[PDB]
Every structure is written in structure tokens, then in C-alpha cells.
Design a protein around this motif. Structure first.
Motif, PDB file in Angstrom:
ATOM      1  N   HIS A 106       0.814  -1.251   0.186  1.00 20.65           N
ATOM      2  CA  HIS A 106       0.189   0.122   0.083  1.00 20.65           C
ATOM      3  C   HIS A 106       0.663   1.162   0.176  1.00 20.65           C
ATOM      4  CE1 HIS A 106      -2.948  -3.273   1.225  1.00 20.65           C
ATOM      5  NE2 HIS A 106      -3.694  -2.479   0.213  1.00 20.65           N
ATOM      6  N   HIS A 128       2.134   1.479  -5.751  1.00 22.79           N
ATOM      7  CA  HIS A 128       0.628   1.153  -5.889  1.00 22.79           C
ATOM      8  C   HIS A 128      -0.155   2.247  -6.374  1.00 22.79           C
ATOM      9  CE1 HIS A 128      -2.969  -0.860  -5.055  1.00 22.79           C
ATOM     10  NE2 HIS A 128      -3.411   0.171  -3.980  1.00 22.79           N
ATOM     11  N   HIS A 155      -5.737   7.725  -3.252  1.00 17.53           N
ATOM     12  CA  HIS A 155      -6.668   6.407  -2.681  1.00 17.53           C
ATOM     13  C   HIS A 155      -6.247   5.793  -1.512  1.00 17.53           C
ATOM     14  CE1 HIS A 155      -4.923   3.270  -4.740  1.00 17.53           C
ATOM     15  NE2 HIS A 155      -5.397   2.559  -4.007  1.00 17.53           N
ATOM     16  N   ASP A 156      -5.066   5.705  -1.255  1.00 18.43           N
ATOM     17  CA  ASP A 156      -4.463   5.007  -0.114  1.00 18.43           C
ATOM     18  C   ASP A 156      -3.642   5.749   0.809  1.00 18.43           C
ATOM     19  OD1 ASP A 156      -5.833   2.357  -0.078  1.00 18.43           O
ATOM     20  OD2 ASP A 156      -4.302   1.548  -1.549  1.00 18.43           O
ATOM     21  N   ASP A 213      -7.674  -0.414  -8.681  1.00 20.64           N
ATOM     22  CA  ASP A 213      -7.107  -1.008  -7.120  1.00 20.64           C
ATOM     23  C   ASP A 213      -6.544  -2.369  -7.448  1.00 20.64           C
ATOM     24  OD1 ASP A 213      -6.532  -0.203  -4.723  1.00 20.64           O
ATOM     25  OD2 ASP A 213      -8.118  -0.850  -3.884  1.00 20.64           O
TER      26      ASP A 213
HETATM   27 ZN   LIG Z   1      -5.227   0.411  -3.193  1.00 20.17          ZN
END
Ligand SMILES: [Zn+2]
Ligand SMILES: Cn1cc(C(=O)Nc2cccc(-c3cn4ccccc4n3)c2)c(Nc2cncnc2)n1
Ligand SMILES: [Cl-]
Ligand SMILES: [Cl-]
Ligand SMILES: [Cl-]
Ligand SMILES: [Mg+2]
Length: 312
Positions: free
Chosen positions: A67, A71, A105-106, A216
Motif C-alpha cells: 500500500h 501502488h 486513494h491509499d 485498485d
Molecule cells: Zn489500493
């Protein structure tokens, strides 16, 4: 103008869904800007604000095995390939919003699931009762946008800024895999009854949700050598969380027990059949040009079966 250019090999292969962004971290910001300039346009953002925003986002990703900042950029590139191959279907605000959504998003991921934060009794679990990490990721996105000189949306009106932030929030919340099962089911029934309507905003919301799941998970849509090595990275995180569950006196689920290491090929088989193949199948139904993601997912499922039969 100063247009962003890539080396010949990258310029050609970045258009392929299975593109790997490579091990040179210092090229990833240039790769992101190139994708923004081509899918959105060179006037979507002030380059200096966009560069300052990119470097603040990078700094708020942590040094975890999966993560991580790599990524983030990999997911944004998958979204780039979907937008370039479906370029009539999305609005100006959607193009702007979705590449940023994917990069962010992470943000500040610690390498732990929402389940672990709940069992640990982490303060974030008290603040956000469902989609805990995903509400945290969005909160981090808003913090960065509100830094001096980081408002990459400063030319939008009040109402447009509010719409793009609402696209980003829904896109990031949708990366919560617990929500994907119900979202793909709805899109599946909506598609099969002929009721799916891309002019219905609540339907667009569901399609962008599925696109965010597909982006994702896009590590299962790469060439076998990339997919196999990336599987080591996710399990490094899963097994560390399993250790932490054992320290709380709780038996971890099997995918997080490092003692069940020899069952990884069967675990992958279950993951492809229950999650990935259905994801990319429903997406190919709605967006036919996203076929190569489904094809590459099926090819990796075949490679894991070849592993189980002891041929790989
Ligand atoms: Zn992710
Ligand atoms: C976000 N993400 C989730 C997964 C994922 O694999 N989840 C998952 C889901 C269900 C079951 C199992 C499962 C049960 N098991 C029982 C014993 C041993 C192992 C084992 N795994 C695992 C993933 N993988 C991946 C692979 N290759 C590249 N990138 C990512 N990425
Ligand atoms: Cl480097
Ligand atoms: Cl860190
Ligand atoms: Cl500003
Ligand atoms: Mg996430």
C-alpha cells in the motif's frame, strides 16, 4: 509550451493496460503528469501547483510493502488506460477528479485492514465506524488540497470544486472491497435487465465505483512475472497483520497466517474466482474496450492453476 515527453519504449507501452511503471521512483511524477496532460489536457492544472501536490501526496504514503507510492501511481495508470479507451463516455470534471482520486486513494495507509483497526480499538475506528481507512484516505486528500499553493482546482467555481471533491470522495470510498460485492451485484442486475443508464448520476457513481475496484486490483492484470512478484508484497503485509492479530489473542483469517504459506496458490485461485474475474467480467460488459484487463486476469488464473498442478 513545455510538453512532457517519455522515452520511446515508455511512450508506446504506457498505452497498454499491462504496463509496469518500473523501479525508478523519480520518474513516477513525470509519468503521472504525462498521463494527466494526455487524458485531461495541458490546461487542466497549473504545472507548479500539480508538481507541489504530487510531492506532498508522495510524502504522505508510507514505506510499506504493498500500500505504497508505487501502488498509487500503478492504480492511476490503470485509470489512465480505461479513460483513454473510453474517451467519449466521461466529463471534464470526471477526468480531472479520477486520476487524482487514484493517486490519493491509499494516502497514509499503515498496511492494516479496517478489521485490525476495529479489533485493536484504534482511534480512527471511533472516528469512522465503516470504511475506516477509506474515510481517513479522503480526509488526508482534503488536508493536502487545503495547503498553501496545493489547490490544483483553484480555477473551478465553488459548485464545480464541490462536484469534483464529491467524485473523489465516492471514488476513494468505493476502493473499500467490503462495498464492491454489493456494487458489482447491482451493476450486474442493472446490465441484465437493460435498466443501466449512464445519464443517471447514481448509476455513473456505481460504474466509477467498479472502475476504482478494477484499477485498485490491476496487479492481477499484469504479465505473470509482475503479478507473481507483487503477490509477495501483499502477503508480506497480510502476514504482518496476522502476527498483530495473534498478539491481540485473536486467530487471524487464513490469508493472514504466515504458517499457511504453502496454501497461497489455492488462496489466489479463490481470490480470482470470487473477486477479480467477476470484477473485470462486469467491467468488460459495461466498458467493452477494458477487455485486455479480463484477458490478462484469466491468463494469471491459468498460471496459478499451473502452480497448483506443480508445473510452475
Ligand atoms: Zn489500493
Ligand atoms: C488487495 N488484494 C487482495 C488480494 C488477495 O489475494 N486476497 C485474497 C482474497 C481471498 C482469499 C485469499 C487467500 C486465502 N488464502 C488461504 C491460505 C493462503 C493464502 C490465501 N490467500 C486472498 C490481493 N492479491 C494480489 C495478488 N497478486 C497481485 N496483487 C495482488 N490483493
Ligand atoms: Cl531513481
Ligand atoms: Cl514511513
Ligand atoms: Cl492556493
Ligand atoms: Mg485502500
Amino acid at each position: 509550451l513545455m510538453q512532457f515527453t517519455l522515452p520511446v519504449r515508455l511512450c508506446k507501452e504506457i498505452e497498454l493496460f499491462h504496463f509496469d511503471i518500473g523501479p525508478f521512483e523519480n520518474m513516477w511524477p513525470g509519468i503521472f503528469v504525462y498521463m494527466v496532460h494526455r487524458s485531461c489536457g495541458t490546461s487542466c492544472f497549473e504545472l507548479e501547483k500539480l508538481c507541489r501536490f504530487i510531492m506532498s501526496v508522495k510524502k504522505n504514503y508510507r514505506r510499506v510493502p504493498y500500500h505504497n507510492w508505487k501502488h498509487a501511481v500503478t492504480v492511476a495508470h490503470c485509470m489512465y488506460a480505461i479513460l483513454q479507451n473510453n474517451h467519449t463516455l466521461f466529463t471534464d470534471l470526471e477526468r480531472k477528479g479520477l486520476l487524482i482520486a487514484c493517486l490519493c486513494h491509499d494516502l497514509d495507509h499503515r498496511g492494516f485492514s479496517n478489521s485490525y483497526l476495529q479489533k485493536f480499538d484504534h482511534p480512527l475506528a471511533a472516528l469512522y465506524s465503516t470504511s475506516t481507512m477509506e474515510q481517513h484516505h479522503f480526509s488526508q486528500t482534503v488536508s493536502i488540497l487545503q495547503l498553501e499553493g496545493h489547490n490544483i482546482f483553484s480555477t473551478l467555481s465553488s459548485s464545480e470544486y464541490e462536484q469534483v471533491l464529491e467524485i473523489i470522495r465516492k471514488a476513494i470510498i468505493a476502493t473499500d472491497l467490503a462495498l464492491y460485492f454489493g456494487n458489482r451485484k447491482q451493476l450486474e442486475e442493472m446490465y441484465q435487465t437493460g435498466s443501466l443508464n449512464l445519464n443517471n448520476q447514481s448509476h455513473r457513481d456505481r460504474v466509477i465505483g467498479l472502475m476504482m475496484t478494477a484499477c485498485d486490483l490491476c496487479s492481477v492484470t499484469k504479465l505473470w512475472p509482475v503479478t507473481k512478484l507483487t503477490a509477495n508484497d501483499i502477503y508480506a503485509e497480510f502476514w504482518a497483520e496476522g502476527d498483530e492479530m495473534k498478539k491481540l489473542g485473536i486467530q487471524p483469517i487464513p490469508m493472514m497466517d504466515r504458517d499457511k504459506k504453502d496454501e497461497v496458490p489455492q488462496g489466489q485461485l479463490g481470490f480470482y474466482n470470487a473477486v477479480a474475474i467477476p470484477c473485470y467480467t462486469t467491467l468488460t460488459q459495461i466498458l467493452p474496450p477494458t477487455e485486455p484487463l479480463l484477458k490478462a486476469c484469466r491468463d494469471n488464473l491459468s498460471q496459478w492453476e499451473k502452480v497448483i498442478r506443480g508445473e510452475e
